[PDB]
Amino acid sequence: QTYFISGANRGIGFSVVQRLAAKSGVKVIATARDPASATALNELAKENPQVKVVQLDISDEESIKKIAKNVSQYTDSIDVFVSNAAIAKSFGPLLNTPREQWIEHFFTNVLGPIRLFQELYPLIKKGTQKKVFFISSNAGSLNLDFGLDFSAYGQSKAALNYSTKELARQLKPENFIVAAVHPGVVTKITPEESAAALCKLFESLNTTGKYLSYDGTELPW
Amino acid sequence: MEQTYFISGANRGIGFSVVQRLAAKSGVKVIATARDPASATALNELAKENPQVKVVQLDISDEESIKKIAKNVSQYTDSIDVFVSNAAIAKSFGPLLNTPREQWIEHFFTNVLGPIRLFQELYPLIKKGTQKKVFFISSNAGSLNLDFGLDFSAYGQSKAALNYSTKELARQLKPENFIVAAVHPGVVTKITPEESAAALCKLFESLNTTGKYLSYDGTELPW
Ligand SMILES: NC(=O)c1ccc[n+]([C@@H]2O[C@H](COP(=O)([O-])OP(=O)(O)OC[C@H]3O[C@@H](n4cnc5c(N)ncnc54)[C@H](OP(=O)(O)O)[C@@H]3O)[C@@H](O)[C@H]2O)c1
Numbered sequence: 001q002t003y004f005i006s007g008a009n010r011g012i013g014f015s016v017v018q019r020l021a022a023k024s025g026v027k028v029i030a031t032a033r034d035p036a037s038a039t040a041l042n043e044l045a046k047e048n049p050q051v052k053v054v055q056l057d058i059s060d061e062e063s064i065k066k067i068a069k070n071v072s073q074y075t076d077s078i079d080v081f082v083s084n085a086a087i088a089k090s091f092g093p094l095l096n097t098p099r100e101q102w103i104e105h106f107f108t109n110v111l112g113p114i115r116l117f118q119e120l121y122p123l124i125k126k127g128t129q130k131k132v133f134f135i136s137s138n139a140g141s142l143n144l145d146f147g148l149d150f151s152a153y154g155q156s157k158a159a160l161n162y163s164t165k166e167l168a169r170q171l172k173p174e175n176f177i178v179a180a181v182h183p184g185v186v187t188k189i190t191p192e193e194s195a196a197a198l199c200k201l202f203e204s205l206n207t208t209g210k211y212l213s214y215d216g217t218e219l220p221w
Numbered sequence: 222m223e224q225t226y227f228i229s230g231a232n233r234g235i236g237f238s239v240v241q242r243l244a245a246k247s248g249v250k251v252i253a254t255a256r257d258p259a260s261a262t263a264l265n266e267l268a269k270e271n272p273q274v275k276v277v278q279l280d281i282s283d284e285e286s287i288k289k290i291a292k293n294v295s296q297y298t299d300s301i302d303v304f305v306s307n308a309a310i311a312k313s314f315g316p317l318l319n320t321p322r323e324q325w326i327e328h329f330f331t332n333v334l335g336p337i338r339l340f341q342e343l344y345p346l347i348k349k350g351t352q353k354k355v356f357f358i359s360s361n362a363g364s365l366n367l368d369f370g371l372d373f374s375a376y377g378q379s380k381a382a383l384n385y386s387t388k389e390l391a392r393q394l395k396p397e398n399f400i401v402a403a404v405h406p407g408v409v410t411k412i413t414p415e416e417s418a419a420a421l422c423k424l425f426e427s428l429n430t431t432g433k434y435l436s437y438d439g440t441e442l443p444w
């Protein structure tokens with residue numbers, strides 16, 4: 001089984017790769033914007049050479065345009081795709097959210113993952129599990145009220161949630177498993193706990209179209 | 222008792238029919254926008270016969286047009302009672318894998334950021350008026366909880382994104398006694414733009430509560 005994780009240099013992403021590397025016969029394609037500076041990740045892959053460290057900046061169309069070749073070097077197929085790399089920089093009122101915050105969350109948090117998936121679909125198609133995971137947020141629900149505004153961040157997660165739902169429909173007749181997943185907040189949980197829950201969720205999940213919290217319970221779109 | 226309405230995209234479709242419906246009411250000034258007024262024949266003829274109809278250039282895809290809308294609307298009115306973000310595109314349907322980069326971008330810029338920026342620019346005029354009504358023309362296709370079997374690609378994504386932000390805005394501006402709504406105007410079983418316009422103008426006048434996702438008939442849609 002070949003897993004792919006965007007944004008593995010730190011946070012939940014690093015914690016997922018670290019758990020995958022422990023598991024028998026898991027090859028992990030793990031990305032960073034700057035793999036040369038990804039001290040902890042590189043260290044992981046030297047210690048566990050089944051972990052391959054590829055360059056990806058999801059905000060950069062020219063970086064996304066190489067991801068298939070870069071991943072093609074290490075695998076003929078992806079079993080489980082995880083769009084984890086994402087930003088979360090702007091919150092609060094719309095009147096107080098400038099143009100740039102909106103644009104950046106769009107390109108990085110919505111277009112990024114759609115292009116990433118578009119590029120890597122041929123490699124996912126050739127694989128066995130045909131599992132596609134977009135790491136969303138519960139803040140992306142149209143039907144949850146946190147007593148908070150999420151500005152471009154929330155909008156971005158809602159937009160990707162919309163397209164995830166659509167993708168789940170479109171790829172059902174190819175036995176694909178597409179899910180949006182809230183990894184928790186890191187009541188706060190450790191990267192290690194988030195990772196553990198997600199790895200369990202990645203192997204267990206058998207139906208497509210779901211919007212799941214890390215614990216495996218459903219969220220309202 | 223004089224009310225100013227603002228409609229983005231009034232040169233054709235639902236936009237024109239709304240301006241036309243409004244022009245018939247007495248004590249209603251209408252700020253009607255067109256990307257290219259020079260060639261807005263029907264809308265210019267409406268304004269020529271109806272001096273209460275003011276035509277103004279707006280491209281919601283163009284930050285340079287948005288920077289100008291406040292000062293330019295301000296030549297024609299001191300306030301906006303009812304804001305209607307009607308101008309949109311619908312140029313992307315079908316599967317995610319067949320939707321090229323450019324259709325995602327264009328739908329974001331025109332259908333999400335355009336209206337946000339337009340509202341930002343026009344908020345102070347709307348703060349200054351009586352009705353404080355803020356309508357975003359959405360689609361039932363933007364619902365995260367309706368299934369029509371069809372793919373709406375970047376169009377639907379753009380309507381969901383604006384929906385999410387519309388709902389947050391209804392929260393933010395409840396303390397300033399704003400009425401904020403996303404409205405599905407119908408599919409134009411089809412209705413005509415004139416029926417859509419008659420039902421929308423009824424809704425604009427009657428809606429007395431914020432934070433709704435509505436169809437043209439005043440029934441609620443799930444987010
Ligand atoms: N934070 C939460 O608790 C929470 C809650 C709900 C959902 N989520 C989702 O879970 C994901 C993982 O969160 P995290 O907490 O691990 O985030 P993080 O550590 O704060 O940073 C996000 C990760 O993505 C990478 N990244 C950022 N921009 C990138 C770009 N343009 N191209 C490629 N990679 C980029 C980052 O690398 P750099 O180090 O280079 O920035 C980092 O690995 C989030 O991105 C978010 O959407 C998180």
Ligand SMILES: NC(=O)c1ccc[n+]([C@@H]2O[C@H](COP(=O)([O-])OP(=O)(O)OC[C@H]3O[C@@H](n4cnc5c(N)ncnc54)[C@H](OP(=O)(O)O)[C@@H]3O)[C@@H](O)[C@H]2O)c1
Binds near residue numbers: 255257308331359
């Ligand atoms: N038609 C339907 O069945 C339907 C269904 C659901 C929702 N809606 C929504 O209802 C609203 C009205 O649509 P419609 O049916 O009247 O369709 P339409 O004919 O496409 O309406 C477009 C209007 O918006 C203007 N516009 C387009 N792009 C613009 C831009 N970049 N800047 C400024 N103005 C621009 C158009 O002007 P130009 O002449 O310059 O293009 C035109 O006046 C739209 O927001 C649409 O999304 C319509």
